[PDB]
Write an enzyme that holds these catalytic residues in place. Sequence first.
Site, short mmCIF file in Angstrom:
data_model
loop_
_atom_site.label_atom_id
_atom_site.label_comp_id
_atom_site.label_asym_id
_atom_site.label_seq_id
_atom_site.Cartn_x
_atom_site.Cartn_y
_atom_site.Cartn_z
N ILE A 1 -5.97 -3.95 13.29
CA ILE A 1 -4.68 -3.94 12.63
C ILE A 1 -4.89 -3.83 11.13
O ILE A 1 -5.74 -4.52 10.56
CB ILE A 1 -3.87 -5.21 12.98
CG1 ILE A 1 -3.70 -5.33 14.49
CG2 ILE A 1 -2.52 -5.20 12.27
CD1 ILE A 1 -3.26 -6.70 14.94
N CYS A 2 -4.11 -2.97 10.49
CA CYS A 2 -4.09 -2.88 9.04
C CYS A 2 -2.98 -3.81 8.55
O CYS A 2 -1.80 -3.48 8.63
CB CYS A 2 -3.88 -1.44 8.58
SG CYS A 2 -4.16 -1.18 6.81
N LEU A 3 -3.38 -4.97 8.04
CA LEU A 3 -2.44 -5.99 7.60
C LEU A 3 -3.09 -6.72 6.43
O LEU A 3 -4.10 -7.39 6.63
CB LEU A 3 -2.11 -6.96 8.73
CG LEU A 3 -1.26 -8.16 8.32
CD1 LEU A 3 0.06 -7.70 7.71
CD2 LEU A 3 -1.03 -9.10 9.50
#
Length: 145
Positions: free
Chosen positions: A88-90
């Site tokens: 996840i890109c977070l």
Amino acid sequence: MSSSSKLRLLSDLQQLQKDPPEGITASPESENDLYVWNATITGPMDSIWEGGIFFLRLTFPEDYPTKPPKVKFTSKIFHPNVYKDGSICLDIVQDKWSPIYTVDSILTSILSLLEDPNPDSPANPEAAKLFVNDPKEYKKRVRKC
């Protein structure tokens, strides 16, 4: 360092067990390893996600909470901020990590991403472009992964 990460992971779990967030569950996979967790989140009850349940894997570093966990979807998903491997890109578990974030805050933030993606950081550029430019086709690709 070992006792402090264990204690913080025990604390994060105790928080979740006391006041479980709606539609979210998470816990160590095994009682013998506090550093590998499975979690589930329930998507919004709308026409895109339909209350679908998704599985996630959180793995914690030895110096947690100084460093963030790595979090990935283990369910397949089509989403602007999720790479092909489920990672996840977070930014709050990346460049913007702070020890102030518990598992509860992290998973609450990821659920928010589901309902409101971030087009600025397109881990999945096809999904990002559809979300921005063709919402009907975005929904179609979400529902048939």
